[PDB]
Paper text:
They act processively from the reducing end of a cellulose chain. The most significant structural feature of GH7 CBHs is the presence of a 50 Å long cellulose-binding tunnel in which up to 11 subsites for binding of glucose residues from a cellulose chain have been identified. In this study, we report the crystallization, structural determination and biochemical characterization of [name] var. thermoidea [name] (HgtCel7A).
The C-terminal linker–CBM1 part was proteolytically removed from the full-length HgtCel7A with papain and the isolated catalytic domain was crystallized, yielding crystals belonging to space group P212121 with two protein molecules, chains A and B, in the asymmetric unit. The two noncrystallographically related protein molecules in the asymmetric unit are practically identical along the β-sandwich core of the structure, but deviate at extended loops that enclose the active site, probably owing to different crystal packing. However, two residues at the C-terminus (438–439) were not visible and are not present in the final model of chain A. One loop that folds back onto the globular domain in chain A to enclose the tunnel at subsites −3/−4 (hereafter called loop B2), appears to be open in chain B and is partly disordered. N-Glycosylation is evident at Asn271 in chain A, with density for one N-acetylglucosamine residue (NAG), but the density is not clear enough to place an NAG at the corresponding position in chain B. In chain B, the loop is open and partially disordered, with insufficient density to build residues 193–200, probably owing to interference by crystal contacts with a neighbouring protein molecule that prevents closure of the loop. Loop B3 adopts a new conformation where Tyr248 points into subsite +2 of the active site, which has not been observed previously in any GH7 structure.
Residue numbers in the entry: 1 to 437
Write the structure that this text describes.
Amino acid sequence: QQACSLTTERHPSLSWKKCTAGGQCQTVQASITLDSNWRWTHQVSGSTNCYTGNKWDTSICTDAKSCAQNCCVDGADYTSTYGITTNGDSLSLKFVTKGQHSTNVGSRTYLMDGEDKYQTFELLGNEFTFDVDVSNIGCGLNGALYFVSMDADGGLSRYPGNKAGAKYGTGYCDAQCPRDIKFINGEANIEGWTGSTNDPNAGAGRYGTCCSEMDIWEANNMATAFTPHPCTIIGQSRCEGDSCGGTYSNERYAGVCDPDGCDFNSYRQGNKTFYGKGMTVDTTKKITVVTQFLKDANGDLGEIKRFYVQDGKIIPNSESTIPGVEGNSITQDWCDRQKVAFGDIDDFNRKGGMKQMGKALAGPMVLVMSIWDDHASNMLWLDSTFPVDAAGKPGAERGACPTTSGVPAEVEAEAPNSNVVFSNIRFGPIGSTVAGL
Ligand SMILES: *[C@@H]1O[C@H](CO)[C@@H](O)[C@H](O)[C@H]1NC(C)=O
């Protein structure tokens, strides 16, 4: 896609902390950008749209290549259109934002390093910490903070049809190989584009976009999970149709990425009252979330550890109480055993497991912060029983939300002003980001 400026693009400012041995930190003045899927997409000459509602203008976009060369994404009205606001070290994402002419649902944002590049993070051997307020996001919603192996320039140098780049939030990929992404590989994903059956603003195209994903935080006030997803191709790759994998079909595991990941959700792992509203990690108030990425003796990713801080108390991660699945952290052996115990296909191991994840963690990953609902599964995989059939067994119940929850139309009508606030990002070597740790 090209970039236009009918709307001046001003990345909202956000500071974060880069920490070093002993807990010294320096404040970095930075900013955020909106993902290209949410932007106004129109002809470079016109303001004639290339995409409206959930449909490409096929009288304008006649092929994937020319569509991206002749259409641009434009700047974003962060506050008024998207309900995206910052205040110092804090980023607030509102769920539904109604304007004069239209209503926006959800957002996905990236941390920037200057105007034209994403701030990359090399997680292996390091510790990523942030504060979060999930009190106002409930069943069926996800306020996510996570890492993906996107290109730092959003694909600008790899793909000549992409002139917008990281400045305009291009180049998204994740371990679900999503096919709803409008520009992939500098080409418009117009081929066989199918309007969503339930989302008036989304559709799905011929191609999907895959890459390694480390889900530090997929959460609402009822459930949270941290989940590495390895991919046999580390960085951003395009996949074709059903070979993509990542949906709930027979072809789920056919793509290069593990769409399930090896997940640690304390509720799912047998501690139903560790995390949630009124629980030990109490989602009705601000939480500090610490995630450490430990190397083994060979320098590979050996362990992923989680600690919380709330009201000054350091809370280690809940131990898993699932028989044969001992420990309060993610390791290869833990994952092997968890998959057996839950009866789940071990695609984590098949796609290279902890070691392959560590290959992505050793290199640059991009910080993603988003608020979204789930038109495919209603977020039941996060906070309810999933799949719905499987009710009475280890692994089935991931949170206390009823299986009625998460239908996008319902949550959008009943909780439009839902929001998540991410704040006080600190990143550095293990032991540098938080005192008493
Ligand atoms: C379950 O969480 C509680 C806090 O609610 C904690 O005291 C306990 O150690 C946890 N169980 C396990 C097995 O870690």
